[PDB]
Structure formats: C-alpha cells, structure tokens
Amino acid sequence: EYKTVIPSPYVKCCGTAECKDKSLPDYSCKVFTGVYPFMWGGAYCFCDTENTQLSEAHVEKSESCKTEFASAYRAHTASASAKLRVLYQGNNVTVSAY
C-alpha cells in the first residue's frame, strides 16, 4: 500500500507562488489563484483576492510495506526432495533425501 504525502500547503498572500518539478515517484504541483482561506481566528492574511496557494504531493511506500507486501517472482525449474519410509529387513527407517 502506498501513502500519499501532502506537505503543508504554501499560501502566498498578496503575491503569486510558483512550483518546481521534482523527481519524486509520482509528483504533482499546482498553484490555485483567488484563494481566501480562514483560520479559527479569522482570515489567513491581508489581501482578499490577490492570493495564491501552492499544493503539492507525491506517492511513496508506506511504513507498512516492511510487513504487508506481495512479492512478484519469476519461477524456473524446481529442486525435488522427498521423505521416504523404507521397511528394510523388518525395520522401519525414514530417510530424508533429495
């Protein structure tokens, strides 16, 4: 399972934000104009319409991948082995052999 990582959004008040490309596994960034976000105590910043928000995210393996995962294998030939019971001269002998 993957986790989507979303860093705190950058809100540039009274100006325009820009984003850079990144090499992260599945990365996207977008700048949204005309944002007027509110905090619990009131509007985030001074400008009303002249605001931009930069949102970015990338996909990476979750911490669970160390325990919960599936392995894709290529199968080839198989080594054979067997456990055989032999009754030899009245005695029961069990031999493990390839």
């Binding site: 399972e1 979303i6 860093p7 705190s8 959004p9 950058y10 809100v11 540039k12 934000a17 820009e18 850079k20 976000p37 509110f38 905090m39 619990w40 105590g41 009131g42 509007a43 985030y44 910043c45 001074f46 928000q53 930069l54 979750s62 911490e63 669970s64 160390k66 325990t67 919960e68």
Partner: protein
Amino acid sequence: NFNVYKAIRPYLAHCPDCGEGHSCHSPVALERIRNEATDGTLKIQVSLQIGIKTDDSHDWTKLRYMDNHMPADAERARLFVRTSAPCTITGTMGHFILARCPKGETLTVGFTDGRKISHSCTHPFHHDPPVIGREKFHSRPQHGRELPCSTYAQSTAATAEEIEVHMPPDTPDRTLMSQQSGNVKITVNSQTVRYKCNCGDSNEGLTTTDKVINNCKVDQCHAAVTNHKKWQYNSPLVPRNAELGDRKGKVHIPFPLANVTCRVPKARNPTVTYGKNQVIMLLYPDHPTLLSYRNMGEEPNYQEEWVTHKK
C-alpha cells in the same frame, strides 16, 4: 527518558463535521486513518497530544489540546472513538490513537475539554476489516486455529516510522485587536504579534508589547500571533510560511506494525452421508463460512461458495 513532545505543539485544524453537520476548526481533527493491520486495529492520527500535559510530562491520564493560542489539559478518560458504535481504545501516545472499531462507514473522535465542553470530529471512512482465514467471525473464540496477521504494537518506541514537523504559520486573531477612538490597539498577551493595515506605515512584524496604531480603523487592520518556539505536525490542513522547505524536523511515531498470530474459529463438523460416487454434507455454520472443493486429478474443477445458513 526522552521527551520529544516538549518541542511539539497541539494544533487547531479544519474538520468537515463537528457533530452538528457543520464544519469548524477543531482541537480534535483527523489527519490520517491507518488501517494496514489485518486484525482490524485502526491507527488514528489526531491534532490532540495524548499522555502529555501542558507541562512537559508523560502523565498517561491526561491529554493536551489547543484553546485559542494556548495548550490546555483534559482527562484522557473523556476521550472517545466511535464508528457505527463506540470503539475500544487499545493505547494512545502523542498524536496517535489505537482502537478496535465496529464495522461502519464513518469515524468520530472527540473529548470533553477543561470547561466541560464537548468537542468531536467526524470523517467518512470505510471500515470493513479483512477476513482472516476462511470464516467470517465477529469475535474471538475460546477454541480455534491460529493464523498469521498484522497488528499495531503497543510499544512506544519507533522503528523508522517518522512524521515531518515544522515551524507553524502565523495565527490570525480578530480578538487580538480593537479600535479605540480611531486608533487600533493590538493586545499582545505575551505572544509576539505581527500586523499590518491599509494605513500608512502600519506594518509592524515585531510587536512584543501592547501597541496602538493611530488614525486607523479596526476594519483596516489584520493581525496574527507569531510562534517560532515549537514545531507542529506537517499537516495538509495547516499552511506553511516559506515557498519551499520551511524546515523539516523528524519525530518518531509510536505503535509500529508487527507480525502477530490471530485466533480464528473452526466450523462445526458436518453431518456426512454417502451415495454412489457422492458425498452428502449437511452444514451448520454459526457465521458465514467458505466451502470449497477440488478434484485431485488433472482438472481440479475448483468450486467455492459462502454458506450463511444450514445447507
């Protein structure tokens, strides 16, 4: 003992439903719900810090939460988690809650604060634990088979599990300022304030004492509290200050995922009678049980069905 939480603050964040069908900024909010465990245990990340008092001490009976611009204490006993029905909490630490919830489509977390005011946050969440084994059971049996499964450990140590933390954004506060005869007074209350107005030379980012901007109205001014003393979780619900890389602290996460063994029930022996090239079974399930069969030759003709009643 290492107290990492001394440098980390609780925070307020937006919550889509605060219990009345209306959104608000809550002392309790759900950042992430982790359900990687196969035993159905949920690991919930919240804006609350549990086990840590306003004073930096690990008192497991207390949680701390934001109240405006300050942390405040509350009893852990008043903390609850609910889905379709109340969940059992299997341990808490910092921002993480472990719980074993009943099947449901929503998740609600909340607590009673220091003023006996209820706070809660609800998110949509599909909770339908995966089946371990070939039977769908609702509770752990006294007798049964044991199969491998994954759970969240109660250990408070971390194993390469980390969260990013950073310096919090300035916090807007309209009660931080008032107009006195055309002169706006900025109340500091011992917390550094940054403010600006439509009035000339109103940009004061270094106010540490109560100050008044003259010949200016309250509607012309904006102010926020500056706090660079503590780190905050890098939540998607809280804005950052810098264009990139404000700062990246790393804090270890409690309750790592681990390999454990789960107990599963064994369905009652079937009543079996025989016919010509035929086996007749009468099944007596308590709960939905998978039946499957195959031929042991070249063409197994595998077939399976779930049996939910006597058949």
